[PDB]
Design a protein around this ligand. Sequence first.
Ligand SMILES: C[S@@+](CC[C@H](N)C(=O)[O-])C[C@H]1O[C@@H](n2cnc3c(N)ncnc32)[C@H](O)[C@@H]1O
Ligand SMILES: C[S@@+](CC[C@H](N)C(=O)[O-])C[C@H]1O[C@@H](n2cnc3c(N)ncnc32)[C@H](O)[C@@H]1O
Ligand SMILES: C[S@@+](CC[C@H](N)C(=O)[O-])C[C@H]1O[C@@H](n2cnc3c(N)ncnc32)[C@H](O)[C@@H]1O
Ligand SMILES: C[S@@+](CC[C@H](N)C(=O)[O-])C[C@H]1O[C@@H](n2cnc3c(N)ncnc32)[C@H](O)[C@@H]1O
Ligand SMILES: C[S@@+](CC[C@H](N)C(=O)[O-])C[C@H]1O[C@@H](n2cnc3c(N)ncnc32)[C@H](O)[C@@H]1O
Ligand SMILES: C[S@@+](CC[C@H](N)C(=O)[O-])C[C@H]1O[C@@H](n2cnc3c(N)ncnc32)[C@H](O)[C@@H]1O
Ligand SMILES: C[S@@+](CC[C@H](N)C(=O)[O-])C[C@H]1O[C@@H](n2cnc3c(N)ncnc32)[C@H](O)[C@@H]1O
Ligand SMILES: C[S@@+](CC[C@H](N)C(=O)[O-])C[C@H]1O[C@@H](n2cnc3c(N)ncnc32)[C@H](O)[C@@H]1O
Ligand SMILES: [Cl-]
Ligand SMILES: [Cl-]
Ligand SMILES: [Cl-]
Ligand SMILES: [Cl-]
Lengths: 374, 374, 375, 374
Amino acid sequence: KKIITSESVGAGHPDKICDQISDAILDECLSQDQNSRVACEVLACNRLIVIAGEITTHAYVDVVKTAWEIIKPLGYDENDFTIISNVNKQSVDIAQSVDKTNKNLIGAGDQGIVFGYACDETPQYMPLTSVLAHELLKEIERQRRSKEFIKIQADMKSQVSIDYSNSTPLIETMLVSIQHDEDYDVEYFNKKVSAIMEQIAKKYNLNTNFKKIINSSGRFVIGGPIGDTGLTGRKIIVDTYGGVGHHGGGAFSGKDPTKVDRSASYFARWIAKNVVAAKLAKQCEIQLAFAIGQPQPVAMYVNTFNTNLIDETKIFEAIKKSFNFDIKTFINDLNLWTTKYLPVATYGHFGRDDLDLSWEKLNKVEDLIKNSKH
Amino acid sequence: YKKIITSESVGAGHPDKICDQISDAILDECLSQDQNSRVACEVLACNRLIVIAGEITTHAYVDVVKTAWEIIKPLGYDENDFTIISNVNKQSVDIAQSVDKTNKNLIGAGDQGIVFGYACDETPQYMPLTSVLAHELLKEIERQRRSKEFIKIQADMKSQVSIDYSNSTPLIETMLVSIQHDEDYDVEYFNKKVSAIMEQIAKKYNLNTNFKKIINSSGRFVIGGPIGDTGLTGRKIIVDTYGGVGHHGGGAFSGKDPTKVDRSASYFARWIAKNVVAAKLAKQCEIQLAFAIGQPQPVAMYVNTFNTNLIDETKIFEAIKKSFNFDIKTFINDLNLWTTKYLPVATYGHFGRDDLDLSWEKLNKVEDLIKNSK
Amino acid sequence: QYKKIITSESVGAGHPDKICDQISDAILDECLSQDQNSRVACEVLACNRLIVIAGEITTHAYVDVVKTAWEIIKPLGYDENDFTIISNVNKQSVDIAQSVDKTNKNLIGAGDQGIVFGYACDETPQYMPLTSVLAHELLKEIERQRRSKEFIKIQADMKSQVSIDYSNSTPLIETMLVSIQHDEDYDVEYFNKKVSAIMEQIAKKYNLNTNFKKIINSSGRFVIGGPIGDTGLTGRKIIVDTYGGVGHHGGGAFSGKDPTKVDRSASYFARWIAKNVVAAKLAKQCEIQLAFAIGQPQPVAMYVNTFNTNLIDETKIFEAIKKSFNFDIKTFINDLNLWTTKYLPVATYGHFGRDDLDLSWEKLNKVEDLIKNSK
Amino acid sequence: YKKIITSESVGAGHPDKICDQISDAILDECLSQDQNSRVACEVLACNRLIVIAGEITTHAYVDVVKTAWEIIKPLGYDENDFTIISNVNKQSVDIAQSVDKTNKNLIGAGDQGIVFGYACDETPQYMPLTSVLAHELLKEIERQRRSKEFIKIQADMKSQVSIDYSNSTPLIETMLVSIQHDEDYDVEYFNKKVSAIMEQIAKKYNLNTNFKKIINSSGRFVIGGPIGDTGLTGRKIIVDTYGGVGHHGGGAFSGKDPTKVDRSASYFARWIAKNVVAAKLAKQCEIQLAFAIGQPQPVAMYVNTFNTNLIDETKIFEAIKKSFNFDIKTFINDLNLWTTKYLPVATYGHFGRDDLDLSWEKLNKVEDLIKNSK
Ligand SMILES: C[S@@+](CC[C@H](N)C(=O)[O-])C[C@H]1O[C@@H](n2cnc3c(N)ncnc32)[C@H](O)[C@@H]1O
Ligand SMILES: C[S@@+](CC[C@H](N)C(=O)[O-])C[C@H]1O[C@@H](n2cnc3c(N)ncnc32)[C@H](O)[C@@H]1O
Ligand SMILES: C[S@@+](CC[C@H](N)C(=O)[O-])C[C@H]1O[C@@H](n2cnc3c(N)ncnc32)[C@H](O)[C@@H]1O
Ligand SMILES: C[S@@+](CC[C@H](N)C(=O)[O-])C[C@H]1O[C@@H](n2cnc3c(N)ncnc32)[C@H](O)[C@@H]1O
Ligand SMILES: C[S@@+](CC[C@H](N)C(=O)[O-])C[C@H]1O[C@@H](n2cnc3c(N)ncnc32)[C@H](O)[C@@H]1O
Ligand SMILES: C[S@@+](CC[C@H](N)C(=O)[O-])C[C@H]1O[C@@H](n2cnc3c(N)ncnc32)[C@H](O)[C@@H]1O
Ligand SMILES: C[S@@+](CC[C@H](N)C(=O)[O-])C[C@H]1O[C@@H](n2cnc3c(N)ncnc32)[C@H](O)[C@@H]1O
Ligand SMILES: C[S@@+](CC[C@H](N)C(=O)[O-])C[C@H]1O[C@@H](n2cnc3c(N)ncnc32)[C@H](O)[C@@H]1O
Ligand SMILES: [Cl-]
Ligand SMILES: [Cl-]
Ligand SMILES: [Cl-]
Ligand SMILES: [Cl-]
């Protein structure tokens, strides 16, 4: 059997708490000052939250109040954490490279490599393993908040394995771990989780006879930052493509759009998704590489995994003709100065049928089709 | 239209790598005193603060300040440069009971997750050439910084290497380096030193010497280390692994004892893949393994040979299953992970290190694989 | 999500409203085969174990309504003892008849007042909305497979609904939904796989994406069906019969009606105009509204809407239509051979864009006239 | 070239409307006795037969003969005019299990389907003027028939009004009425009465009086009601709604309890559209909603403002999502659909009825829409 597996984590997972605080701080800066330079990193461990990084802005963000906005809906209060604010300014050496003399150009905020990915497995143009893993946790957290699923807490993880041996996928295993109250009823808990798992499988017209692994540790009462240290940018595969897509290593949360790790990753997704939606391939991955201070990528590679429906050279040419690779220009084309990032800090940045993200729009299919012709 | 693949590396004074080094230095000290330590040490370094956190249950005592100074003093920092915060929590007893089975003789996985192992035949290291070259550039620059053969530079540095794989012999397309330099440097001397190092590395691998060189594209890099950019443990996971050519499941290595399968199973998967390729069963091999917390074996496995298999894929899969022990306690012991020193892999990658002697890099399973693949 | 997601439906041959439309039109066809001057307005109700055949017929024909009903219901699996049949056939009001039969002038007066809309667009080779085309194709294929036994343990009552995202210039399928009546002992895994493959095969036939949401038997159980599960009546699927909610509708039903009922004949006429306008490349979409008065031989109003997709001035389209078509009711009925057309075939799967049939109102025989008259 | 739009209405003695009235009178009787009734009552009226059929599961008992007599006696019929057939089946238990969820806080949609809600600013009713005028003609004639101000007429009648929208002020182009009359009527009196009523309605809406009048074009209409034409429930769905100016999804209203979304969601969509227009977000608004049997929320929505939007269409869409709850059970309760009497909307249209007090006609969401659209 060909068994592929991906994961997700919930809103009370400690790494995700950090991503949410980073992006909530970013969103508050950008709401006040659209030219903010923000690289906000957070650490959450036991009873300490550290808010750090490099920010140059006209805004003022109350980082304590912002942190409380993320942690109060998970059950924490104002006395649970020491908060350390260590906000440095952006290095003037980086800033002079980004802010070019030509005021219509933005130089890349760093070197690096990013990958964008899309496939035709799901309506989201995402790997089915990742879609199912996120949907499981979104439903559990929805029920936790509405009180349809009682005596659970917000720290949780999922993992879904799919059998791709035949042309119809089968679910092989669904796994969930959910932090629970000391006085929980394990029979009620197992039945709730089993039902949620089946409901998600049925929503995607899949089999319902898969293995279920429910709270395999056998006890999960200690959780959140008490059980495990969180840091920003430690769930980059959960944030992206579940291990089916390649990754260049850059984290998203807490970064303004001049950080190409974020903005060019969104751009690359937008390209790949439109290539696949245009039916030029079943799977498409776009690698882009950058040099600090340079306003365009220094390299690009387009991989269609032998699923291309037209010549690879024509795909590559259609992409070059249909997209503008100037950083300032693609930041503007995707409205990244006015996008709210907090909503993508949980449950993935891509394929979000619950959100309206610019990099998910299929508005380049007509250009790609026209530019790919004979 | 050329096929250009790009990977990166970072130096010992890069702030994320400072954190990885402190994490692994702390781990090495714990394991030297107590081979049953449970350690998950996470570090943040920003401006003038180093935060040492995570979850440790041990009979050892580690002087975290002294350990941090051992990493930062060779980079030019002193005892008054950083506030050091020590926030060492204990391992959750709920996780511990799942890992330390009542049985004895078994170790349960320390978490769920997915890991990937990768190997290819491009280099004697069985690693992607892009990654090998990127690391070799920075190792040589840092060697010269310490010997004073390359003056007026500092320890924060990055590299990026682009290779053109359009034809059967790879060609270097671009080598890029950024190196933190002193205010009073001589840019002409600096450019000449870097150019020569780039050519020397290319010649060491018998490659072309006519490639593009991008040297300090920002045009000024005086501010650096944690002053210029916040570092965190486990934020260079692609640099630590396969440079974007191999998949990644998202787990970080540094600071973790071998019961954390993100580390131990990633090493195990590498060991498998490298032996597959060394046994000439394939030119490239990638192995995915998935885990469930508390369970002593993987819950899923997938083997990809990218259509470079020299025998039937099913026989490779079977030979792997027959030639390795998938029990976690057993593979931890087969790789001598309780007595391996991790600090040396906290810079310049955990894989393909022909400068080190790592158990997961040994070609001691070739014989078994060949026998079991009939 | 913020999107232009447009949705249309279809229903199958064993859907209870469609059973009624088929019995209505089969009765009409038998009358017109015997007497081309028949006046027929045949309405059918099917509930539980009763079929009522009613309406107003004046004819020299004789139709065996029981035998006709059995011709519709036997291929769906019913037998001769499943329904009580009530035949309540009244004559056409002589007050309506004298208005329609203008023997004096050689004219036909409209059989009623009313408004009709004809519609066409360039999305499909049928010149129909893609949502409607796909919805019908799904059910035609499932019913084809039911009869050939390629798809087992299903019954004839079924519905489909297709949602397309038109937010950008290329349409993408958003959702395909089907509900199919199934046997008690069915295998849900086999059923899901069969439906999924049919859905994908229809998408691929039209060169569309195959990664859309699939909603398959959302009720979770559909063993009770046909008139037992739901009452059918003639003329309760007028949007399925026409343009799936993309086109406007004036409210008139088609089935069971002879061509003097302008609800039917003028609807067909308006489709014929709209289709030819679009095929002539005068517009990408065209909707024609016509209004009538009982006893009057021509429409009392007309409006032509090209939805801002006109390729030439709207006044020239309007003029070309007036020069190319004859709006006298008797004349357009004869131009479309409506007295000799068989209507049973259009009582399932829609009256328009039927590339599986040869309908007069679907012929592109006015394109040359429209192009010439638009200059 | 004039832009002439036309709509119709029919009177209380029209045979299709007789059926709609008996359907809704039966429904009202069921709901007065049992608010959890499930009712889908369909009626056929032809020559001398009335058939009362459909699917009802209830604790109520309705005397269907007495109910039918309550509709037909004020139209001049008596107890010996019709054979009455009662064929009341129960609701399919297969449908019922889908609608009446185990989770008793949800109602699943009673069927699949598409509904459209519409509103425009042409009249105080927020309805197309053509429809408003057509209904007003027949309401006034029927009022006069009953008060004996218009003698020697009967209750079967129809109207049709054509308006020229070529210029910014609408002009009436044609008014057409047909009214069933006694054999011994005086045609001159009748023509003058109808002409005056037509002028009186035009003057009520401040319109022109120079339009074409088409009065009893057939030239004789003594035979009428079910003797002249067969009626069925749900055969005037355009007259019931928006006169051909709004789109329609094909579902009928009369005889259905609120779990049939063809009715309840049509009312809900009207309530949205009307409030959008009253809030001055657009001059015309049409809302399409699609449903799946057993699912408690719509599966699709589209909002069309016909390029008359006064703010961005995305902000209208967002304001609607924030201001309305799309859960079926919730919108049924918000509109008090279990306790609304439906008989009054079975003649003269279900929308824009400034002579009734309908929940879906209340402008009680304008403040929410304005607030949520900033
Ligand atoms: C407070 S902000 C803006 C002050 C003033 N409104 C202005 O435009 O100058 C100025 C600097 O404070 C630093 N800073 C430190 N903590 C901060 C916080 N919580 N929010 C915003 N900036 C902060 C950043 O480096 C930032 O560039
Ligand atoms: C298992 S912990 C990671 C290792 C931890 N750092 C240690 O000291 O062993 C990682 C994630 O698993 C989840 N987790 C925490 N305690 C758990 C338990 N008792 N059972 C299952 N999952 C748990 C939480 O989401 C947590 O962030
Ligand atoms: C210091 S250790 C060893 C003490 C004594 N040797 C023993 O065997 O119990 C005990 C606990 O201290 C906590 N601790 C806090 N900081 C520490 C540090 N710097 N090194 C080791 N353990 C630390 C860990 O949770 C660990 O389990
Ligand atoms: C450019 S910084 C990352 C973004 C930064 N947090 C900011 O506030 O914009 C990332 C890495 O690039 C390198 N770096 C820092 N300053 C640099 C410069 N002035 N030129 C080039 N590379 C630099 C250092 O290795 C640093 O860790
Ligand atoms: C049976 S038809 C034709 C009889 C005879 N062949 C003739 O030419 O007079 C005469 C009338 O019967 C009434 N009728 C009742 N049931 C009928 C049916 N089943 N087929 C045709 N006409 C029917 C219609 O009103 C029709 O005008
Ligand atoms: C759902 S029924 C209509 C409401 C019904 N009269 C009642 O009493 O609730 C309308 C159509 O849906 C289909 N239908 C019937 N039973 C169904 C079921 N159990 N699941 C799905 N669709 C069904 C049939 O095509 C039927 O004509
Ligand atoms: C008359 S009601 C039952 C009266 C009894 N009060 C009860 O609660 O059970 C029971 C069934 O009768 C059927 N029925 C037949 N004709 C009916 C009618 N005229 N009014 C109500 N139900 C009728 C419906 O299917 C309904 O669910
Ligand atoms: C004209 S009839 C429709 C077709 C009719 N079933 C037939 O057999 O020809 C439709 C409606 O028009 C009205 N109508 C009936 N007889 C009429 C007449 N003599 N002149 C005008 N309208 C009439 C009634 O309102 C009736 O419900
Ligand atoms: Cl984790
Ligand atoms: Cl970096
Ligand atoms: Cl239906
Ligand atoms: Cl009518």
